[PDB]
Ligand binder design. Sequence first.
Ligand SMILES: CC(C)CN(C[C@@H](O)[C@H](Cc1ccccc1)NC(=O)O[C@H]1CO[C@H]2OCC[C@H]21)S(=O)(=O)c1ccc(N)cc1
Lengths: 99, 99
Amino acid sequence: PQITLWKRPLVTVKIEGQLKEALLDTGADDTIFEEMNLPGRWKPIIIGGIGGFLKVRQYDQILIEICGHKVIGTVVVGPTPFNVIGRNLLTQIGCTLNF
Amino acid sequence: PQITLWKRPLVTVKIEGQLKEALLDTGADDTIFEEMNLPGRWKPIIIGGIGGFLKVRQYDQILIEICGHKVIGTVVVGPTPFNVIGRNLLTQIGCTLNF
Ligand SMILES: CC(C)CN(C[C@@H](O)[C@H](Cc1ccccc1)NC(=O)O[C@H]1CO[C@H]2OCC[C@H]21)S(=O)(=O)c1ccc(N)cc1
């Protein structure tokens, strides 16, 4: 699919059997989701953004099904205004910017 | 130009006669740059990102030359770890996401 940017590039994803909308964020190095349970041992980490830094939990090799594709990679969990699909998963689907 | 996401999608831009690198950010609704002066009257505003909110100065109708293209739109000035090209200017260059 080709996605314009006139509106927020939100996509429906399936992660750990839960349905969520996430933002295709080329400005996000990593993927972060709002609170939820995930499989595996997680290490507490901290991420930094525009308005400050955020303490969160890091999970490795998490399966997300995004708009019909599948990817496995690091997913961070913590308070975010949006679920964000960072570049760690965008590359796996071969996502690119064009103009 | 086609841009993959294995590396940060930074581009060289020319704004107010100054050369800067900025992040092509599909997750950013608006464009924000680190401190600098700009033409016109600015209204103080506050933006909200991951980890908190940030007070900034809003400027309207600002010309940025991005990788050979020209755009005019709202640019916000404030303390950000990166200069970010939000969707308010990405649409003007016809930027899209593809996969
Ligand atoms: C939090 C999102 C819903 C929106 N953000 C855009 C996003 O691309 C930022 C843009 C960004 C880029 C670098 C630094 C701060 C913010 N990237 C980001 O938060 O990524 C974080 C998760 O992965 C890591 O990658 C770096 C930061 C971490 S935002 O920076 O806060 C933002 C919000 C509104 C406007 N008008 C402009 C920018």
